[PDB]
Design a protein around this ligand. Structure first.
Ligand SMILES: *[C@@H]1O[C@H](CO[C@@H]2O[C@@H](C)[C@@H](O)[C@@H](O)[C@@H]2O)[C@@H](O[C@@H]2O[C@H](CO)[C@@H](O)[C@H](O)[C@H]2NC(C)=O)[C@H](O)[C@H]1NC(C)=O
Ligand SMILES: *[C@@H]1O[C@H](CO)[C@@H](O[C@@H]2O[C@H](CO)[C@@H](O)[C@H](O)[C@H]2NC(C)=O)[C@H](O)[C@H]1NC(C)=O
Ligand SMILES: NC(=O)c1cc[n+](COC[n+]2ccccc2/C=N/O)cc1
Ligand SMILES: NC(=O)c1cc[n+](COC[n+]2ccccc2/C=N/O)cc1
Ligand SMILES: *[C@@H]1O[C@H](CO)[C@@H](O)[C@H](O)[C@H]1NC(C)=O
Lengths: 530, 532
């Protein structure tokens, strides 16, 4: 009758899973495990509360609801945007996590990978097809955990000082799921003493914030930050700006105008109403600059991520960090004048200067003219193809590449063993136009072994390539070293070595855009303060 | 009795010259022609008085005295420094000019080249061997004129507003000589409707200030700016700072016995021996290289606005200019104070010496500005490589002081109506005494433009003599026609294409951009930074 491999007991009660198929063999999956009390009604904006025990058997055979979030509609029906859109019904009752393990369940402790999805802290879900853990788990014999965490106002609205909207509760959802992993992953065969966090974009920034928050640091052992960093300009907000943004959302939804009374009014509004006004609280209208992000209030983050990175002892830490070849291109089609996936986006000088203020919001004009000085080729100041590439650089450098390089350089010089990569393979199945190169987010499907899905159109070399990346990631999870053949050297502040990841063997290079990132990380700070 | 070719009448009276031998035949030289009353005693610091007429024949047969100036002593006996030092006795009686003309005198009017020497406005002389006009005149049949002008405190100490030391008298010395050329160059066979100014370093800056001063602009028709521009950070000074430097010098020498009355102040200065003023000249500065004590002052009179204001406001139609730089403009200056530098070793500096050199080479900018300079000129993949640090500090110093000011001037003249030609001089002389690490240093194109290699007592090789003959032709072609050309072609410089030619033994090679990236930093961004 019942397959014993799919029955598991955890602290809160009993679970029933589902056997899944991969081209390499079966896999055990436990999907939609509740790890928190549903943050509904009076629990909205509040820190998560642990899930109370249940009787009977929770059905963990299918993904659970996606946390309430805005839906991308820029290209309705387009594969490249819909693949990130919610693929289950939206609900505030969304605090569930998923566990994939080998079949039969391992009987000795197995290394655990924990995935935190990105989405600008306003979107995402652990149920997206591209985050399917069945391939990594079968190919590399790890246990894979992913959780949903509250995004948008539901996870990061903050009235600093108040107990009714304290902020960062989306980060506390992540931590609670990390706590759940410590207490329960052993029942699945996982080793709670070998937990590697990994995440992309705002998920990579989340990982970094768990590295810089002592209550989280005891819940995992390694970290992987893909195309994201806690020191990114989009990843945190100050207390005063967070209060301004929260108050502005209240006014926009008909709410006064006392923290207690404003949150109370906010808790009466349907969730979709908060979503619908989310984008209209920002200071300037631009691509980027998400409304509700982690707040630096001296609690979860006792200081800014940049300050905590500079002051940190990181001996005993191994991290894997990296970027795609063209981090900036994907973001340009969301409001940089002249850009479109459906045309070559050959922009004009004036459109270029306009894109700079949109891609680097929040900076003085002297700062913006410093940007256009540095990214203008003064022998070809008006070439449209060069201006397209240069603004892609402006946007990718400022928001992804240079924060990652600053994290990597500081962690390495202060005790961590860091491995750095640049992902340079353009998927043969990629739907975005060729002028975008290798865009943001497009390494994920290879990390998760999606090319091994037989019902997809990846080439045979792309499958070999995916198996190489899964082996790198699992090797790092098992030992803190991706290497097993040309070798991947650690990244250091001086040599600045990284490897290119594509169909060719590893190629070692120097410098994560060192010249450009010297501008963002070393000069531009001094210009803004004085 | 007398050679008729060596006798000339000008407005003030009669002159007798000399017939000079050249490697290519005779030349008539009139050396040491007085063009102003000697600025002695009560006329110290005053504008030049035109020379009063004389009876009899004035012997213009040798170079006259060098205007009082400080004497370089960094490497005593070394040709690389002694070649710029005075080769005549120092005197305040020094306002004389020189005319070289073909022998026999031209029958039809001949275009004139007027040379203005450099020396940071504190040094120089028209009598330096490397300024000998006999080769240019012989090879290209032109009239060449060069003048002495007051330098240091004697030419540029300014108590602005006062009549006893209005400042810029060294520039007025140059203008008086230009006026002399208009009234008198025809008597030597020269064409006063074809006068081409050319000068180097502070001489080039001087040439530019005459472009931007309307009273001077009527006295010439074409300009050549070699390794200098009026808009360079070293070339001008504000009235308040000029008054401060003048007052500190006076104080350093006991005047007054603090400023007070300007007339009282200058009169005390005028009783000090010239050598005393020279000996205290460099103490008046806030130290570094480069910044010079007494330079032209922007005071609304000779310069109605700053040179960069005048350059942007300018309509330059009908003007032809030839501008350029040597290959390594900054290396020569570094051995005069940059820590770790010497002509006698490799000057392979440390990063801390690089950072300290930046403050010395870019003096009087904020720490934020200095940070921006270190960011731009640091290779962040090789931030401490001593050889790259050496070249980078040379680039900092040369771009800031020479290349980028000239590039700003070239692009604004071309955009606002002038025909512009641009060069980079890239031949390191076989006779060069400076070490190899300096490349082609500041000032070492001059000997080739003046045809100095044609001198048989010098050991230039034969291609270098051909090279010197090529450049003399380019320069004289420009003076004649406003275009140095006469296969391969030298295209004009434009704000867009930014084309220039390299000058070395090889044929002409066209290239784009006078360090366009680096100069965008100095000319476009850094001014915005310093206004915030
Ligand atoms: C290169 O030389 C400079 C200057 O030193 C002079 O030149 C040398 C070749 C030698 O002849 C010295 O006797 C001269 O004094 C060196 O910089 C100096 O270093 C000394 C300490 O040794 C210091 O007291 C001076 O202040 C420095 N002066 C300057 C201008 O920096 C430099 O260290 C030498 N670098 C080498 C050896 O490669
Ligand atoms: C500074 O001193 C000079 C010289 O004494 C003054 O100039 C003279 O002023 C007197 C009147 O006090 C006149 O009679 C003389 O003809 C002036 N001689 C000149 C012009 O040299 C000058 O007025 C004083 N200026 C001040 C007081 O600032
Ligand atoms: N304003 C928008 O429509 C919007 C919505 C979502 N995103 C980001 O979501 C896409 N995404 C989300 C998570 C991870 C990767 C990616 C994309 N990679 O190319 C951008 C703009
Ligand atoms: N003693 C000094 O500090 C000093 C420094 C520089 N100069 C300038 O004189 C040299 N010079 C004078 C005129 C033209 C060119 C050049 C240099 N070419 O490399 C004089 C004195
Ligand atoms: C693969 O390509 C075929 C067309 O050759 C198309 O019909 C199919 O939908 C594609 N499937 C995937 C997984 O993209």
């Amino acid at each position: 009758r019942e397959d014993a491999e799919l029955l598991v007991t955890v602290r809160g009660g009993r679970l029933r899973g589902i056997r899944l198929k991969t081209p390499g063999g079966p896999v055990s999956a436990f999907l939609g495990i509740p790890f928190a009390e549903p943050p509904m009604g009076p629990r909205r904006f509040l820190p998560p509360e642990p899930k109370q025990p249940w009787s009977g058997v929770v059905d963990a055979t299918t993904f659970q609801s996606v946390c309430y979030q805005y839906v991308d509609t820029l290209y309705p029906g387009f594969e490249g945007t819909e693949m990130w859109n919610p693929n289950r019904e939206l609900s505030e009752d969304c605090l569930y996590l998923n566990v994939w393990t080998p079949y039969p369940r391992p009987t000795s402790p197995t290394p655990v990978l924990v995935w935190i999805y990105g989405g600008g802290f306003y979107s995402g879900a652990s149920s997206l097809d591209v985050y399917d853990g069945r391939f990594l788990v079968q190919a590399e014999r790890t246990v894979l955990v992913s959780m949903n965490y509250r995004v948008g106002a539901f996870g990061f609205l903050a009235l600093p000082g108040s107990r009714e909207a304290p902020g960062n509760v989306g980060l506390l959802d992540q931590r609670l799921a990390l706590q759940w992993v410590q207490e329960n992953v052993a029942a699945f065969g996982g080793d709670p003493t070998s937990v590697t966090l990994f995440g992309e974009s705002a998920g990579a920034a989340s990982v970094g914030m768990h590295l810089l928050s002592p209550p989280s640091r005891g819940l995992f052992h390694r970290a992987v930050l893909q195309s994201g960093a806690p020191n990114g300009p989009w990843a945190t907000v100050g207390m005063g700006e967070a209060r301004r943004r929260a108050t502005q959302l209240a006014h926009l939804v008909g709410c006064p105008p006392n923290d207690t009374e404003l949150v109370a009014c906010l808790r009466t509004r349907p969730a979709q109403v908060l979503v619908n006004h989310e984008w209209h609280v920002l200071p300037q209208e631009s691509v980027f600059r998400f409304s509700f992000v982690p707040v630096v209030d001296g609690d979860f983050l006792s200081d800014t991520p940049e300050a905590l990175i500079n002051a940190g002892d990181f001996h005993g830490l191994q991290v894997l960090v990296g970027v795609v070849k063209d981090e900036g291109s994907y973001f340009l089609v969301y409001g940089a004048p002249g850009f479109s996936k459906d045309n070559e986006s050959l922009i004009s000088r004036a459109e270029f200067l306009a894109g700079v203020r949109v891609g680097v919001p929040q900076v003085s004009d002297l700062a913006a003219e410093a940007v256009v000085l540095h990214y203008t080729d003064w022998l070809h100041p008006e070439d449209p193809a060069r201006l397209r590439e240069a603004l892609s650089d402006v946007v990718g450098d400022h928001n992804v590449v240079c924060p990652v390089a600053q994290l990597a350089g500081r962690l390495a010089a202060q005790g961590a063993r860091v491995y750095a990569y640049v992902f340079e393979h353009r998927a043969s199945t990629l739907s975005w136009p060729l002028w975008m190169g290798v865009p943001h987010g497009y390494e994920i499907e290879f990390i998760f072994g999606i090319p091994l899905d037989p019902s997809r159109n990846y080439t045979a070399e792309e499958k070999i390539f995916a198996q190489r990346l899964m082996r790198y990631w699992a090797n790092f999870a098992r030992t803190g070293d991706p290497n097993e053949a040309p070798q991947w050297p650690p990244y250091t502040a001086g040599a600045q070595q990284y490897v290119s990841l594509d169909l060719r063997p590893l190629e070692v290079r120097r410098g994560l855009r060192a010249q450009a990132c010297a501008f963002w990380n070393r000069f531009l700070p001094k210009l803004l303060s004085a």
